[PDB]
């Protein structure tokens, strides 16, 4: 309700959002009539990237699996031909938000090979996932590394699981059980969690 549009948006000859209306209306138009859902997302982006520059608010753009925007799709036309990511309005309107042509906020993103298309299992570095186009689009950017648990983090995670009584095997609390957990997961948080799920 505080944020207000700055242009008349025409959903249909009958229905339009007048200048100065609260942003929520646009969102509601996307939630009520799905026909205008995709048009309603872009408008939202167009407002937020603009008004944040004016200084009304700080904006955080948090995109998980950002590597999907400059990759390939598994979507097809009716002629069984491939569709590129830029052909999608939802993906085309989200790339504009990744460009640093606005101020008053920060853009945070996290790569993910899980669910990625046409990538090998062991590819995890920025270029391998992003592609040339993705790296060029994000360049310049600050990369931050996320590693496996160090001994302190691993011990704290197991102490949390023991404090929630989530490790029911009688040997898991013992030190030998902890060494075996450490070896079998190699301190990887996901593998450790999955192995602790059925212990």
């Amino acid at each position: 309700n505080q944020i207000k549009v700055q242009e008349k948006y025409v959903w249909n000859k009958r229905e339009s959002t007048e200048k100065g209306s609260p942003l929520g209306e646009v969102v509601e138009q996307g939630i009520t009539r799905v026909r205008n859902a995709t048009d309603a997302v872009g408008i939202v982006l167009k407002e937020l990237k603009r008004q944040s520059s004016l200084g009304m608010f700080h904006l955080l753009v948090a995109v998980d699996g950002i590597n999907a925007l400059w990759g390939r799709t598994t979507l097809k036309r009716e002629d069984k031909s491939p569709i590129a990511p830029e052909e999608l309005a939802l993906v085309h309107n989200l790339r504009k938000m990744m460009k640093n042509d606005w101020h008053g906020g920060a853009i945070v993103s996290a790569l993910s090979q899980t669910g990625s298309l046409f990538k090998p299992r062991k590819a995890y570095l920025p270029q391998e996932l992003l592609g040339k186009e993705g790296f060029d689009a994000l360049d310049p950017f600050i990369p931050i590394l996320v590693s496996n648990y160090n001994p302190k983090e691993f011990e704290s995670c197991i102490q949390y699981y023991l404090e929630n009584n989530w490790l029911q095997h009688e040997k898991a609390p013992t030190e030998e059980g902890k060494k075996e957990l450490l070896f079998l997961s190699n301190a990887n948080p996901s593998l450790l969690e999955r192995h602790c799920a059925y212990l």
């Binding site: 062991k122 060494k179 075996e180 450490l182 070896f183 079998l184 190699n186 192995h195």
Partner: protein, 181 residues
Amino acid sequence: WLIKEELEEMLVEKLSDLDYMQFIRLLEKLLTSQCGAAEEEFVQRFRRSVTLESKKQLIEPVQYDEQGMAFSKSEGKRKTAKAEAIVYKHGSGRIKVNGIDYQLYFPITQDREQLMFPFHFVDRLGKHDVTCTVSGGGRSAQAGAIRLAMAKALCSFVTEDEVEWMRQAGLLTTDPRVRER
């Protein structure tokens, strides 16, 4: 005790089974009494030898790399998979399989347990670094070959009792079960 045919060969005379029993009974009676050195040698003329199968376990030598770190190398085989492992005396439990961390090279937990078995058995988890190169076969054949190679390399840094225990656990034996025609 010397077998019947060996007594035949030494005496250069054929003898039945009952008279060989009788001779062995006399020899045992002589053994029971306080036989002297001459009698002990006379008995030893009639007692052959045998051997064991624990000294035939080869313990590889310890080599040194350029940095001065001690290590030991070995080979293992499982089906068509062939593994070549290097175990360092000191380490932090880092295993590199074809230059790749083991939890990445072996997604399946069974293979990671196979790699864990050798160190867990002798309680040296997190005390050694391993660099191994495997080729051929599938995931399970590769894991078994790596386990064999790494156990054969680890035999160099453990006590002879631990080497025998690893042998008796079936860790130092190549599996001969292969696909049949």
